[PDB]
Amino acid sequence: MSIEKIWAREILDSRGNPTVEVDLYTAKGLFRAAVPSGASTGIYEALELRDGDKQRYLGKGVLKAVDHINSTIAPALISSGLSVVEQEKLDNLMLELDGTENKSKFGANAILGVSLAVCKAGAAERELPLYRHIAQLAGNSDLILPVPAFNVINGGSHAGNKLAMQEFMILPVGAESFRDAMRLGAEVYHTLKGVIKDKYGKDATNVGDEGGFAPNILENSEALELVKEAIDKAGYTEKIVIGMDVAASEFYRDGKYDLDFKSPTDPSRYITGDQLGALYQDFVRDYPVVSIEDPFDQDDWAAWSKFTANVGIQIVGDDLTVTNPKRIERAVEEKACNCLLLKVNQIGSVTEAIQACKLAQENGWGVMVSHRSGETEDTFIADLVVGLCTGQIKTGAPCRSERLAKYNQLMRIEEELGDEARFAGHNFRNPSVL
Amino acid sequence: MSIEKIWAREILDSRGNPTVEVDLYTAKGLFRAAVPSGASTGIYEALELRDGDKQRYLGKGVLKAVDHINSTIAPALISSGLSVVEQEKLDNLMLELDGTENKSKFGANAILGVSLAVCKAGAAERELPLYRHIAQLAGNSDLILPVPAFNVINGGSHAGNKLAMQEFMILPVGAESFRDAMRLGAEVYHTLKGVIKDKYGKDATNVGDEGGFAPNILENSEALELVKEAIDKAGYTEKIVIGMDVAASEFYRDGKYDLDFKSPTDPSRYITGDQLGALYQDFVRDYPVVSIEDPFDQDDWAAWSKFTANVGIQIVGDDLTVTNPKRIERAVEEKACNCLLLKVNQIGSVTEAIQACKLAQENGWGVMVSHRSGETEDTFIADLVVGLCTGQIKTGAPCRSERLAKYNQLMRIEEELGDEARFAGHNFRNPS
Ligand SMILES: [Mg+2]
Ligand SMILES: [Mg+2]
Ligand SMILES: [Mg+2]
C-alpha cells in the first residue's frame, strides 16, 4: 500500500563511529533519515544497540540494528496497511513489535531511524513541508523560529582539556531574525578564537566534538570570562546571553562532584551539591547566564528541586528527564527543573518525543530541541523545533557541518515562511507567549 | 523551457564562514548545490568573491555573489532556453557573461554554485544518477570507486600547532572495497587518538578544520611516526599507506622554505628547495609515503621538475596547477608533477573541471578529486570522483560530517553499483 520499501544501512557519524541510516520508499519518492549518537549518555536513555564485534569498528558496528530494520521491522510496516501519514500508529506498531520498555530488542537507534523516515514520507504524502507536518502531529498551528544556542567552548568527559563542565553556549536573543542570529553567533565565535589565541596561544584554538574551541583551561568561571569577553568585543553585549550544559552526572563521584575529574583522582577536591549550587549562583550573578542544563546528577533529585526553587533562570533537564514521559512526570511533580531537553534518540521515536514535548509545555516548561555530540548530515531536528514551536534549539557551534546543516536548514525554513516567519527572540523560554 | 527558477542564498560553511548555495528548479524538481571554500588558496585560483563589509561576518559575506546569481545569471540562463543537460553550453554562457579571465566580475563561487546545480538537474533530466551523468559528460564508460585519503593529522597555516606541513593522510589501498576502506580509515583514526593521547596528553587530541588531530608537535617526521604507529597498531601495515599535502607555498619565504613558520621569524632556520627535496627522500625511505602534494612553492617550477624526475611516487599539483588547463599544460611539458588535484572551485565550473581532469589523464597523470578545508553538507565531489573514474579522493578525516557526507555518499554509490562496482585499490594512480 503506502510503503514500497524500507532499507537501512551503516554510515559514519561526525566522530567516525557507525550509525543507522534508513531509506524509505513511497510513490512520492525516497525519504532518508539518520540516527544521532551521544557520548555523555544518561543511564536511563533508551538502548543504543551496538554489535560488540571487537574486530570491526572496535565493537561499535550497528549491523544488528540495521538487520533488525531490514529483516523484521520493514516487512511488518509494509504489510501493516498503514499510511505513512499515520505517525502514531506506525510508531505504536514498532513499539509493540519491540515489546520492551527501553527498546532493548531492536535498539532505539533501529526504531528511531524508521520513525524519522516515516515522518518525512508522511509529510510529502500530506503535501506539506516537514516542519508543518510535525506541527499538525503535535497539534500546533503557529510556527516559531528558535533562538540558536551555540556551544562555543567545549569541556567535559570527551573534550581535550581540564574543563570539567561540558558546554558553554551563546544565545542571540536580541537578534532581528534567525538568519541574523546566525550572523551574531558566527561573529562572536570568530571573535572568541582571537580572544583565546591572544591569551593561550594557537594550540588552544582547536575544536571539540561539537565545534566549540577546546582551550587548555580548568576553571569554568574562566570559560565564562572568555565567552563574555568575546560577546563584548564583537559588540553584542545587549543582544547575546549565555547558556550552560554542566552534565554533572559525568563528574559525580561518591555522592559529591569533581570539577577536576580529568586530573588524577583526589577526593580532597570534591565538593557537595550545596557548594556546587553556590557556584552556579555566583555564575548567574557575575555573568549573563540565563540557562543551566544538568546542574546536578541524574538521580540527585533533592539538589535539583532545591536549586530550581532559588533561581529565576532556565533549568534544563537532560540526563535527568531523558525525553521520557515517566521521568518528566516526576520532575514536574518535584519541580526539579523548568525546561526539557528534547533528544529523539533518548526515547526512540518521533511520537514519544512529541508526547514528551507537549507533556513539558502543558506544565509551563520550556523545551530545547537538541542534537547529540555525535551527529550526521541529517537535518530533521531543524524542522522539528519549528513544528513544535519550542523557541530554542542547540545543534552545535557555528562550526562542523553536522551542526551547520541544521542551522542552514533553519535559515531555509525562515526564508520559506516569508512574512509569517517569527523569531522567538527574548521569549525563547515560552515562545507561545509571542 | 528547462529552467523554471534559479535562487541563491547565503549559508555557512564548516568553519563558520558564509558561502553560496544555489537552488535550481526544473519540472523534475529542486536541485541544490553549495560552494566549498579554501584557506590555503593558491594565488592563481579563480576569484572567490567576498563582500568586504567589515561590519558583517568580518568581511566574509557573499551577498554580492548571491546577488549576481539572482539578479543577473539566473534570468540569463532561463532566457537562453537551454536544457539543463547542456552542461557545456550553460557553463560557456556564464563564462562569457562574466567575460573575465579569473571570473572576477561575478566570482567563481557564484558561477560554480549554478554550474553544480545545473549538473544535478541535468542528471535527473537524463534519468541518471549524478555520477553516471558526469561520466557521460566526460565520455567515460566504466566507473571506479576511489581510494579515500583521510587527513588524520592536521598542520599548516590554519592548524593550532607548530606542525608546518599541512596534511598527513592514510590510504587504505589494500582494502577489499570502499566500505571496507572506510572501516580501515576510521579504525586507524580512532587508534591514532589513543597513540597521540598516550604520548602528548588529551590536550593534543582536539581536531583541526578537516577533522584530523592537531597535536602540539613541530617535527613533520613525528607526524609520520604517529601515523605509522597507528597503522601498525591497528594491524594494517600491509594495507594502508601514507599521503601528504605539504602546501609549501604557505611557508615559502622568497626563495627558501620555513618549516617553523608559525614560530617567531628566524631566517637562519630556512632551508633550500634542494634540502626540502632531500627531506622528502628521507620520508619516502623511512615511511610508506606514496604521494606528496605541493612539495614546493606554486612558482618554484625548477624544484618541482627536479624532484619529480628523481622519485617514483605520486607527485600532486594543487596550488601549482589550480585545476587550470593553462597551468596544467605547462606542468605537463615541464614534467613538474604526475598527478592533478581536482578542485572545482579553483577553476569555477564543472565543464572546465572535467576538461582539466581529461587533460591530465590524457597525458598519463593521476587525478585526485579534492574538497576544500571549508566544506558544506554538499556531496557533489563524491559523485564526481566516481564519474571521472580518477581512483582517488581526499575529502577529509573520518571526522566532521562535511567530510563524512562525501564518504557516506561514496558508500551509497558503491552499494548502488553492486556488481559493477570496482575498488581502485593499489591502482589508485592508474585505474585507467
Ligand atoms: Mg550527555
Ligand atoms: Mg546535556
Ligand atoms: Mg590550499
Side-chain angles (χ1 to χ4, degrees):
Chain A
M1 207 167 237
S2 195
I3 302 173
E4 295 180 353
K5 194 191 226 169
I6 296 183
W7 184 249
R9 74 175 56 82
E10 197 181 41
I11 61 170
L12 297 188
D13 59 24
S14 58
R15 270 192 291 255
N17 293 328
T19 188
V20 176
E21 171 174 273
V22 173
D23 287 2
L24 191 149
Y25 292 85
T26 63
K28 292 196 168 51
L30 165 62
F31 304 94
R32 176 172 298 154
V35 180
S37 179
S40 59
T41 55
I43 63 181
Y44 300 113
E45 295 193 16
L47 180 70
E48 173 186 274
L49 185 57
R50 300 280 180 175
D51 295 343
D53 184 13
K54 297 303 176 183
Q55 305 319 116
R56 198 185 171 270
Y57 282 108
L58 309 185
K60 281 179 164 259
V62 291
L63 299 180
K64 289 181 182 181
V66 165
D67 179 71
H68 282 142
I69 297 178
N70 292 341
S71 296
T72 306
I73 299 181
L77 296 193
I78 286 181
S79 64
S80 64
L82 297 169
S83 174
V84 284
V85 305
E86 311 241 61
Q87 186 69 32
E88 184 162 354
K89 287 184 181 297
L90 281 166
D91 278 341
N92 282 342
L93 179 52
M94 289 191 296
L95 288 182
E96 256 162 47
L97 209 67
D98 178 274
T100 70
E101 191 67 32
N102 301 320
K103 303 173 175 55
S104 54
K105 178 190 282 181
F106 296 153
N109 51 341
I111 297 178
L112 181 62
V114 177
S115 185
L116 295 170
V118 160
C119 194
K120 301 180 195 188
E125 195 67 60
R126 221 69 173 175
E127 298 170 323
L128 294 173
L130 179 52
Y131 53 87
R132 187 163 294 284
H133 178 53
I134 297 174
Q136 299 187 350
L137 290 177
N140 297 330
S141 53
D142 228 340
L143 314 174
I144 275 287
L145 271 302
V147 176
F150 305 103
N151 184 17
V152 293
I153 302 277
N154 300 347
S157 299
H158 302 263
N161 52 16
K162 316 291 288 174
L163 200 55
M165 296 180 188
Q166 195 174 256
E167 307 175 11
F168 292 83
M169 294 169 287
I170 53 179
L171 291 71
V173 293
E176 299 298 323
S177 55
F178 183 88
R179 292 179 257 179
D180 190 55
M182 288 308 308
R183 183 181 59 89
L184 268 65
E187 291 184 356
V188 169
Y189 178 82
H190 298 315
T191 301
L192 178 57
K193 186 171 184 179
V195 175
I196 295 176
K197 174 184 177 179
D198 293 340
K199 184 169 182 175
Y200 297 103
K202 56 179 56 207
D203 295 336
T205 61
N206 305 294
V207 300
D209 291 341
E210 298 184 11
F213 305 105
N216 48 323
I217 62 179
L218 168 63
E219 307 301 343
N220 301 287
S221 60
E222 177 63 20
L224 289 170
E225 273 293 338
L226 293 172
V227 167
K228 173 178 174 154
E229 186 175 345
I231 295 178
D232 298 348
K233 176 167 180 173
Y236 298 117
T237 301
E238 62 285 327
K239 301 196 200 310
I240 299 183
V241 296
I242 304 180
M244 298 177 64
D245 185 357
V246 174
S249 299
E250 297 291 311
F251 55 84
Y252 182 66
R253 290 186 181 180
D254 305 328
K256 301 178 187 177
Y257 299 87
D258 183 11
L259 292 184
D260 197 15
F261 76 102
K262 281 173 286 178
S263 297
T265 294
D266 181 22
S268 64
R269 76 197 174 207
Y270 297 177
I271 63 175
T272 60
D274 295 339
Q275 291 172 296
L276 187 53
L279 185 65
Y280 297 147
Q281 299 278 11
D282 288 338
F283 290 170
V284 172
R285 145 211 166 209
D286 293 331
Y287 306 102
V289 176
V290 302
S291 184
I292 295 185
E293 172 186 334
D294 279 344
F296 305 97
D297 184 74
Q298 53 201 326
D299 282 319
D300 196 347
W301 292 88
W304 278 82
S305 294
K306 175 169 115 85
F307 180 77
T308 295
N310 290 275
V311 295
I313 67 169
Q314 177 170 259
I315 305 299
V316 183
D318 175 22
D319 289 337
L320 179 77
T321 44
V322 293
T323 324
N324 199 323
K326 309 178 153 185
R327 285 227 115 204
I328 293 167
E329 264 169 7
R330 176 177 179 179
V332 168
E333 294 179 60
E334 291 203 34
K335 287 181 162 61
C337 58
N338 53 31
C339 179
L340 169 71
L341 202 78
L342 202 83
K343 293 170 162 173
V344 286
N345 87 310
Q346 273 187 335
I347 190 55
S349 72
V350 177
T351 294
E352 286 173 296
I354 291 184
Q355 290 175 2
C357 174
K358 281 145 65 44
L359 180 58
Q361 291 171 323
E362 279 167 8
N363 292 281
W365 282 20
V367 176
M368 183 181 286
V369 176
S370 177
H371 59 178
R372 299 314 298 263
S373 53
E375 271 286 344
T376 67
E377 49 271 32
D378 177 273
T379 67
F380 183 90
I381 61 178
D383 293 75
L384 182 68
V385 66
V386 170
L388 297 181
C389 309
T390 82
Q392 36 177 347
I393 183 182
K394 65 168 193 174
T395 172
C399 179
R400 305 169 65 120
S401 288
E402 72 271 8
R403 321 298 166 183
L404 279 321
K406 282 79 160 173
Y407 291 119
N408 291 328
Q409 171 66 8
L410 284 169
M411 290 197 295
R412 296 190 194 99
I413 293 179
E414 187 182 62
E415 173 191 282
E416 184 175 60
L417 289 182
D419 61 323
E420 300 285 358
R422 300 289 182 268
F423 184 61
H426 292 98
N427 303 90
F428 64 99
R429 296 184 56 175
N430 58 343
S432 83
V433 87
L434 225 60
Chain B
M1 292 299 294
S2 194
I3 307 183
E4 312 194 337
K5 178 190 272 173
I6 294 173
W7 179 254
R9 76 177 58 84
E10 188 182 54
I11 67 170
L12 297 192
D13 61 16
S14 56
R15 59 163 55 99
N17 287 329
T19 186
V20 174
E21 172 174 271
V22 175
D23 285 5
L24 192 148
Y25 292 85
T26 64
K28 287 195 170 57
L30 166 62
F31 305 93
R32 177 170 296 159
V35 185
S37 179
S40 65
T41 58
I43 60 180
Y44 299 115
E45 296 195 11
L47 180 82
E48 179 180 82
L49 181 60
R50 299 275 178 182
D51 296 343
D53 183 7
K54 234 130 166 172
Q55 297 294 103
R56 208 183 168 272
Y57 282 108
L58 306 176
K60 303 299 193 60
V62 289
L63 292 185
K64 295 177 186 177
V66 164
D67 173 74
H68 284 319
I69 296 173
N70 294 341
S71 297
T72 310
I73 297 179
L77 296 196
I78 294 178
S79 292
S80 73
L82 288 175
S83 179
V84 282
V85 305
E86 301 293 334
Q87 186 69 31
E88 190 152 346
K89 293 181 178 298
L90 285 163
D91 280 343
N92 277 334
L93 191 54
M94 287 185 298
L95 297 186
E96 291 148 14
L97 203 65
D98 173 271
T100 78
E101 165 73 8
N102 61 319
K103 303 172 170 59
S104 50
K105 183 178 170 56
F106 293 156
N109 50 340
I111 295 176
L112 179 62
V114 178
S115 181
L116 293 173
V118 161
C119 195
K120 300 180 200 196
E125 194 69 43
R126 288 264 192 251
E127 291 290 336
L128 284 169
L130 180 55
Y131 55 87
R132 282 193 189 279
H133 179 54
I134 287 164
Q136 287 173 20
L137 284 178
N140 298 344
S141 299
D142 295 302
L143 305 172
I144 269 285
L145 265 300
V147 175
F150 306 104
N151 185 17
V152 296
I153 300 279
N154 295 346
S157 297
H158 297 260
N161 52 21
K162 309 305 297 181
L163 196 59
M165 294 175 185
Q166 185 178 91
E167 306 175 19
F168 292 82
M169 293 170 283
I170 54 181
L171 288 73
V173 293
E176 304 295 313
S177 58
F178 185 88
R179 283 172 271 173
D180 192 51
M182 286 310 305
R183 178 180 63 89
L184 265 58
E187 285 183 0
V188 170
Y189 177 81
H190 297 318
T191 302
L192 177 56
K193 189 178 186 177
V195 169
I196 289 182
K197 179 184 175 180
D198 290 343
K199 186 171 186 176
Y200 295 103
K202 55 178 152 50
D203 274 340
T205 59
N206 302 310
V207 299
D209 290 339
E210 301 196 359
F213 303 110
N216 45 316
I217 61 177
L218 180 44
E219 313 278 19
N220 300 286
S221 66
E222 174 66 15
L224 290 172
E225 262 296 327
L226 295 164
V227 167
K228 185 51 179 175
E229 256 201 75
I231 299 177
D232 298 343
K233 187 170 183 175
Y236 297 114
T237 298
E238 335 84 2
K239 291 156 156 187
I240 301 185
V241 290
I242 303 176
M244 299 173 65
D245 185 354
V246 180
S249 301
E250 295 298 318
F251 54 86
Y252 181 67
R253 297 299 181 254
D254 299 319
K256 296 176 186 171
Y257 297 87
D258 186 11
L259 293 180
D260 198 9
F261 74 102
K262 281 174 284 181
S263 291
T265 296
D266 185 13
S268 66
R269 77 199 173 205
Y270 296 175
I271 67 177
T272 67
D274 288 343
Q275 291 180 258
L276 192 52
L279 180 59
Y280 298 142
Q281 295 281 1
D282 296 339
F283 290 170
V284 171
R285 186 193 65 227
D286 301 331
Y287 309 94
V289 172
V290 301
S291 177
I292 297 178
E293 172 191 331
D294 283 345
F296 306 96
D297 178 79
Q298 55 205 332
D299 284 318
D300 200 347
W301 291 91
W304 281 79
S305 295
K306 182 188 181 79
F307 182 67
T308 296
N310 285 276
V311 295
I313 67 170
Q314 179 170 256
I315 302 305
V316 186
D318 177 22
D319 287 332
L320 175 78
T321 48
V322 292
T323 322
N324 191 313
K326 307 294 286 182
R327 289 225 112 205
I328 293 168
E329 278 182 13
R330 173 181 182 180
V332 165
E333 295 175 42
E334 300 194 27
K335 290 181 159 60
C337 56
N338 54 32
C339 181
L340 168 68
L341 199 73
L342 199 81
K343 299 169 162 179
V344 290
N345 66 312
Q346 275 187 329
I347 191 56
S349 81
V350 181
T351 293
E352 294 167 291
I354 294 179
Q355 293 174 357
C357 178
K358 295 188 65 179
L359 179 56
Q361 291 177 327
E362 279 170 3
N363 289 277
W365 285 15
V367 171
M368 181 182 285
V369 172
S370 175
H371 64 162
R372 297 318 292 262
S373 59
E375 273 294 333
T376 67
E377 50 269 41
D378 180 278
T379 63
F380 183 90
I381 63 179
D383 290 85
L384 181 65
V385 63
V386 174
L388 295 184
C389 316
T390 80
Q392 36 179 343
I393 180 181
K394 67 162 189 180
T395 174
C399 180
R400 308 169 65 124
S401 290
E402 71 271 12
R403 321 303 165 186
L404 278 325
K406 280 75 158 170
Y407 290 121
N408 291 334
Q409 176 62 16
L410 279 172
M411 289 201 295
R412 294 186 196 99
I413 295 172
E414 171 164 272
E415 165 189 308
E416 185 177 81
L417 280 175
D419 223 349
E420 193 178 341
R422 230 86 62 186
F423 183 65
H426 288 284
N427 294 99
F428 68 98
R429 291 185 64 177
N430 56 346
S432 38

